[PDB]
Structures are given as C-alpha cells and as structure tokens.
RNA sequence: AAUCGGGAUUCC
RNA sequence: AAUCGGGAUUCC
C-alpha cells in the first residue's frame, strides 16, 4: 500500500480530554484519534501533520481538521474507524488534499458556539464583595439593577420561609447538611430563573460591541499594546433568544461568534466579559475602553459551554482548480453534525452544568476577589 | 442478598488517574474501583465509606484500604472485581471489619516510598541563577562542590566536541534541531552518570536528620508555628544502595519513609528539601533550621517517584479480640505485591522518567526561580 | 498541554 | 480534586 496525503475532518465531545493537541501522557483527542488509525488500519507505527484549531482542555467541537496521510484504499475504512472510535469522537468523511495544503495557515475565518445559562446575568449577591464596590458606587448616580433586587429578595424570602435564622454564613453532620440545602436552595433559585428582554438586550449590545476590527490584548494573557497579535477581527457575533432545555428546566442563550483568527482563550475572555458588564450595569460603552489604554485584568469563562461550530478555509477553496481536488466545505455535514451536537455535546453541557456546578462556580468566584475596578463605574 | 461490611485492599498505578479520592468527572482510582465492582456484582446502584490515604494525583501505592458494604456472597468474587478491572489495579483480599473500624482514625503508621534518580543530586548548571547565587557566596568560604565541578566541566568538553560554536542559549527547522540534539545530549551526561559515596552520605545524613518529632510547618502548604498540626514524627527512614535499572541505564536510589501521619505534599517537601541541601552543598544542619523561626517555601517533588508502600493498623490490631476478626497485616500479600510493583509502577517510573523528562524538568525549574535564601550559605 | 511558588472559588 | 488571576519551568 502507498502513502497518501489526506484530510480528516472530526467532531468531538472535549469533556474528558486535555485539549485537541497531542500532549500524552495525557489522554487528548489526537490520541484517541492515532489509537483508533491503528486499530481501522491507516496507521504504520513510530510516529509522525497540523490541525486546524488547538481547542483548549474541556472545549468540544462540531468540525475540526487535522492532515495526514494515511492507507486509503479500503473503500470501508471510515466506517471501521467510527467502529474503532469512542461514541464522543466521530469522523465525519476523508477528503483529499494537495501538499501545499497547509492547515494552520490556509484557515481563513473560524465560526465558534457558546452556551450560556441565562441566570449568569443576574447581578452579584447581597453581602458580597462586588456588590458592596457597587453599592459604593452610591456617590456617582451608573446603573440601577431593579431586576436582581427583586430576584435576591425573593431568594432571602424563601431562605427565611425554608430555614429559621440559622447564621449558616459560616462554615469550614447537619450544619454540612443545612449550608449544602441552603446551596441546593440558591442553586434551583438560579435555575428557575427566566430572563427579561431588557437584560438580553444589553448583553447584545455588548456583544454587537464587539464586532469589528480591534486591539484584543486584554482578552488574552499575552502582550501588551504594542504588540502586533493584538489587533483582530471580528465579522459577525449573534446571541440568539432564550432557549429551556433538560429536566431541571434551565434556560441557556447561544452566542455563535465568526471570527478571522483567535488569540489564547480570547473567546472566553470575552464572553466573560460581556457578562461581567451585563451583570452589574456598567455602561455598555466601558467595553470599548478596554480596547483603550489601561490593562485590565478579565478572567475566561468556563470551558464547558465552549464549542468550535466550523472552521472556514476561504483561500484554500478559491485557489483550487475546477477539476481534481474538492473545495473544504464543513456545511456539507450539517445533518450528522447535528444529531451529534444534540446527543453528545449539548446534552453533555446540559449535564454538567447541572451536575459539576461550573457556572454558578464562576460567578460565586467572580464576587469574591482585580477585575472590579473596571466595573466599578469608575475606571 | 443481606449487606455486609468489609475492607478491601488494593494497589494500583497512580498515573493515569486523579488521585485516590472520588472526585467526578475526573478518573481516578476510586472511580475505576465502583465501575468494576457494578461489573462483578457487589455493589447496588445510586450512590453512598473512608480510606486509609488520600494518595495525590499520580501517586501509586502497593497497599490502601477501602471500606464498604458490598455483597460478599460469590466465592470467586475478587477473581471477578480484578477480571473487570484494568492491569494497573489490583485487588488484593477482602476481608471483613466491624462497625467500629474507621479507616482514617484507626490509622496507626504509614509507610512511604520514593523512587529518586542520582543525578538529581548533582550541582546546578553554570549559568543558572542558582549557581552565581552560589558563586555570589564567595565571600563566606559553606561547601565547595568538587564533583559536579568535572560533571559540568566534562559535558562542556563533549558539547565543544559535538557542536562548533553554536550560541545556541537562545530560543523561543535546524536550530530547533540543534537546541533538542543539544537537550538530549545535557539528558544523555545525566543519566551515565554514577552517584559517589560522598554525595551519598550527604543524602543519608540529611535523611536522617529528617528522624524523630518536629516541628513540620515549613513541609506542607498550610499554617506556621503556632499550628497543632504542624507537629509531626518519623519513625524510620532510610535511603537504599545506588542501582541501575532500565534500557537507559539510569541510576536509581529508594527512599522508604515510616510516619505516624502526614500533611499536604510532606514526603514530596521533604524529599525536595533533601536533593536541594545536597546539591548546592549547604549544610546539613540547615535542615534543622527549617524546623525554626523563618518560613521558607520548598516545591515539592515530583509526584512520580512517590510510592505509598502500605499503611499500618497496630490500633486496631491489637484491641482486636482472640477469635472473630482478622488483623489487617499488608506483610501477608509480600509475593504478589512485590511482582505487581515491579512489573506496573517501577517499570512506569522508569519509563515516565525516560520519556515525560519528570525529574530533568524539576531541577531544571530549581535554577530558575525563593528557596535560594535558605541554600545560598546564608540565612 | 503538563509541573511548580503563592491568591481565590466550587465540589469535597 | 477541579476552576481562576498572575510568576516559572518541561514537552511542544
């Protein structure tokens, strides 16, 4: 059998795994990716390439490239290769490819998909230490939250009505038990929560803020202004109407971002961004100055609701000729790719936030700490 | 079938999981342990216990202790529990206990192993901060290193040998070729390397000094003096004969540790603290020190090496009755454990140590850096 | 991606 | 045990 260069397009469930790159010992989706080549047999031995995303650890992905060659000959091999692979890890189809074809550099634009619980937005806690800076924001009339008010007090309503004064706001048999219901109380608080229009309506207002062409060195940990990486582009960003979904009934918002390229978790850091100012009611505008001159320093959303929709190869497509190599189109898949998102990754996101408590762990750890003097109306 | 209280006793490899501890979603020992006691058919369903150590994340053990109900019914039952579960854990007997029993109090003493190659007891590098550290103790005429004085000396002689003149102390095709080639060869001089009597003695005189009740604030990530905690003893400790083991050659020593009981990351502290008073030469009885006054931060070792050999119940052993209930002795499994050892963790330690540049990686760290003060002949 | 020094949260 | 703010190393 002769070599043969090739392109594998995949999708996965990244929970599980410590990223796309291969990095053993520990387990990565390139890993299980070779396991599986050698157990179909388009694989020799020894060792060895590119890709078209690096997802970080946790992060999934609909559509993902990598490059290689490979026996194809077996006109049932991609068949054997789903066999041979876990059911959170599927090739989607084998196309091939030229030797100019180069997968980090010919990727054009990338369409990335976030999930969000919308009770993210709800402001900080009564007693915490971003709501007293904001509280300390009683000398310059800012925003106003009218909304979390009503939804805290209601919360300090039930507390009282399920437990009797207990100052269970201590802790280090039963005491474990009441603060774990007293969590499991804030918790379904949380996610009984139905957001309002007006919420959703600043949160893509930041969104749509940040569209465009910008210097992103504050949604990375890299280098400053003066640094070339730092300008990018982004072309479109749509947050999409409020959506419950599962058996605890919590209710999620997609944001899908299209971007040109990407810096280290600048995803993240900007949807965590765009949170943290719909959250307390900075101005909408504050965003715009982090583009501007003082570093600030924005910690990245979890990884769980994270998902790379496509990656788009725009230069590779219209350099090639008219007969002899198929152009790289990812919505060719859409049907498949589908399916898998609903079973294995949106349920999967679903569950976890329900069970490992990412959210709301971010968020209780977001009040508790850098980043407050931009949301501070004042900076 | 009724419910029936008992422990198990187990080994496994530490690699590969995230600690001993059930801790979802992550693997981990635990973990892998229910999956295969659903799959032999001893335990129910839902969810529900101690253990003897809490080993971290890649941490192995020849010997740990659970304590559950299960349904111990099927005379070939553990054949069942070791047939479901993977080669790298083992289950060595299961054998009954009363309600009093608890694995976490009734812990009387543990016994530690650590598996530690020679050439990280050589001096560091020139060049590194820590040596003109050193060399800035020309002052004070402390302890002058004669042996990694022809150790370095003669790696510099085989790199004029093997290179021409390459500055090659600097990077971020060839020259990533050369600057590997040229790793290699610093990983090739450490590992042909045999460790002296001198050194050794060093070690051993440190080790020792490590004997008896003190004061252990400054090995755990915690409070300081005024802690009860920080109060711990050592009964034994002893460090082996130098050998070579492996394809590679290396050259290995065993530390065995005997404790009462132990604080976060303590055996790797302490270990680290041992290697880092022997390789700049600072005086033995500075380790003493570390039991005084002034704080110091210590890194901990690498987690590979770390070997939990068995831990000890002479509480329960003795307030045990003449008849009715088996003394829990881990001396009773000596044959299988000692094969188990050999064949799934020494031979993965060797094997990480080669490949996954564990201990290189660590004293390679040591140079670039808090804890010079203490070694830097003067504190 | 992994390790380590500290600071913080969640599950233990 | 996991996440995050920075500082450092190893493999990439």
Not at 138 to 160: P, V
Not at 196 to 225: E, I, M, P, V, W
Request: hydrophobic share 35%.
């Amino acid at each position: 059998l002769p070599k043969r260069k090739v392109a594998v397009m995949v999708g996965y469930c990244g929970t599980g795994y410590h990223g796309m790159q291969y990095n053993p010992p520990n387990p990565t989706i390139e890993s299980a990716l070779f396991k599986a080549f050698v157990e179909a047999g388009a694989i020799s031995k020894d060792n060895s390439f590119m890709r078209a995303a690096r997802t970080d650890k946790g992060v999934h992905a609909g559509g993902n490239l990598i490059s290689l060659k490979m026996i194809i000959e077996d006109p049932d091999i991609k068949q054997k290769i789903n066999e041979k692979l876990p059911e959170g890890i599927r090739v989607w189809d084998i196309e091939r490819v030229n030797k100019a074809f180069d997968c980090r550099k010919m990727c054009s634009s990338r369409w990335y998909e976030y999930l969000l619980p919308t009770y993210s937005l709800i402001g900080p806690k009564p007693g915490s230490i971003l709501y007293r800076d904001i509280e300390e924001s009683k000398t310059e009339l800012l925003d106003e939250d009218l909304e979390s008010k009503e939804f805290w007090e209601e919360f300090k309503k039930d507390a009282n009505e399920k437990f009797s004064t207990e100052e269970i706001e201590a802790i280090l048999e039963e005491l474990y038990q009441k603060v774990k219901k007293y969590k499991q109380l804030e918790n379904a608080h949380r996610r009984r929560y139905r957001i309002s229009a007006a919420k959703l309506a600043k949160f893509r207002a930041s969104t749509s803020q940040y569209l465009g062409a910008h210097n992103f060195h504050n949604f990375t940990l890299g280098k400053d202004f003066k640094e070339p990486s730092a300008i990018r582009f982004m072309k479109d960003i749509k947050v999409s109407d409020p959506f419950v979904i599962g058996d605890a009934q919590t209710e999620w918002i997609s944001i899908k971002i299209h971007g040109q390229s990407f810096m280290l978790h600048q995803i993240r850091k900007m949807v965590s961004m765009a949170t943290l100012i719909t959250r307390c009611g900075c101005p909408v505008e504050r965003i715009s100055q982090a583009y501007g001159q003082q570093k600030i320093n924005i910690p990245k959303a979890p990884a769980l609701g994270l998902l790379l929709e496509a990656p788009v190869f725009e230069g590779y497509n219209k350099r090639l000729e008219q007969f002899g190599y198929k152009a790289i189109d990812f919505s060719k898949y859409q049907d498949e790719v589908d399916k898998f998102k609903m079973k294995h990754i949106y349920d999967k996101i679903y569950k976890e936030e329900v069970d490992e408590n990412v959210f709301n762990a971010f968020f209780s750890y977001i009040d508790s700490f850098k980043s407050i003097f931009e949301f501070l109306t004042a900076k």
